[PDB]
Amino acid sequence: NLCPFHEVFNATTFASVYAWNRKRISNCVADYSVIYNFAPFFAFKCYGVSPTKLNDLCFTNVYADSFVIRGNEVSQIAPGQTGNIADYNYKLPDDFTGCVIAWNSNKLDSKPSGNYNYLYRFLRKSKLKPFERDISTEIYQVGNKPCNGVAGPNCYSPLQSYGFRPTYGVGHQPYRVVVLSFELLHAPATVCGP
Amino acid sequence: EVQVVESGGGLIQPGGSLRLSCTASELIISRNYMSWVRQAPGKGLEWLSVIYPGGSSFYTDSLKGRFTISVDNSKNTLYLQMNRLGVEDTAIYYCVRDAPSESDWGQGTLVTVSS
Amino acid sequence: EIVLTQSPATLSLFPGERATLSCRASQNIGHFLTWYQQKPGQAPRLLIYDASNRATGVPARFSGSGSETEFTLTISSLGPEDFAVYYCQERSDWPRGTFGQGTKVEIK
């Protein structure tokens, strides 16, 4: 029973980075060569595992976290990184095992007059713990005077829209990102990679 | 109107160190994007460093090692430790709060490095 | 590194005239650019953010336009108080970014 990797990578819509979508892959036989050999997925980078040995290993589960971010913000998707996305939207641990695949989706995620459907969090009371998700849209009190949860001066909505347009440099163009996180719990290894 | 007040300027010898302080009244510095921007006399502005609401801090390449931004949550103030200052570090240092639609600057404090 | 070249270095106009100021970037920074007003001997003041949006409290005569590599700031009618130094700052890595050299406004 082959895995849905192509169903995750070729999905028509990706989630906002603040609400990054996680899929569990288990009870399957995996094939990472198709992931590795496909041309457009150039931004390939794994930590604690090499792309060459992925077939030999087996894991209890494999998680696929998918989202859309800016091109220059892709560098923040790695162990030990800090920044907007690393702090408030999607944090990976320093001991992260599994890896991140990103590609430019300007052809399909960008829209003339801006794509405001992709949002990210830029204000939070504290950094995210690794693999934490925060979907709260409550108005963030940055000022001293509380504003009772309604937008106003010195209290804003914590989510910012990306506004992707077909133009702009590679840095500001949308990048669809998929993070394959491997897991071992001493349970039966339900995903092998022959 | 939002007011941010800087402090800790003045004279210092070359190669010395200084720590500027910045405080705000109507906002919480701990929960804001607070950046330090200097304006050399008769020269253009230069963004030096920022500290995020979560505590992440970033610096320009030319300043790496010599500057260290920080915050003390209890006092509601922002600090900029400055070390190994040269004659070119003389400038008026602004404590600026950044928001998506607002950018609130303080009046600044002159920092002079001379003998 | 992104370097912004503002032009003209000095813009000499009479009161009531329309002032058009240009900022040009070395790289495609999209719409991420900010315009700052600075009276002499005072801290800068936010005019335009995202290269087109007018900041709260700014009078309607100020407006921004342009994108990618060629940005422009327009004052529809110069009042006496509009005579100042205007800085363009790119915000590709907001709140980080480089500043332009600025453009003073003076006639007499």
Numbering used by the authors:
A (entry chain A): 334 to 527
B (entry chain H): 1 to 115
C (entry chain L): 1 to 108
Paper excerpt:
We now describe the isolation and characterization of a human monoclonal antibody, 19-77, with a broad but incomplete SARS-CoV-2 neutralization profile. Structural analysis revealed that 19-77 recognized the spike RBD in the “up” position, and its epitope overlapped with the ACE2 footprint. Structural analyses and mutational scanning led to the construction of engineered antibody variants, 19-77Δ, with a single amino acid substitution at residue R71 in the framework region 3 of the heavy chain. These modifications resulted in greater flexibility of the complementarity-determining regions (CDRs) of the heavy chain while binding to the viral spike, thereby enabling three 19-77Δ variants to neutralize all SARS-CoV-2 strains tested with much improved potency and breadth, including against the JN.1 sublineages.
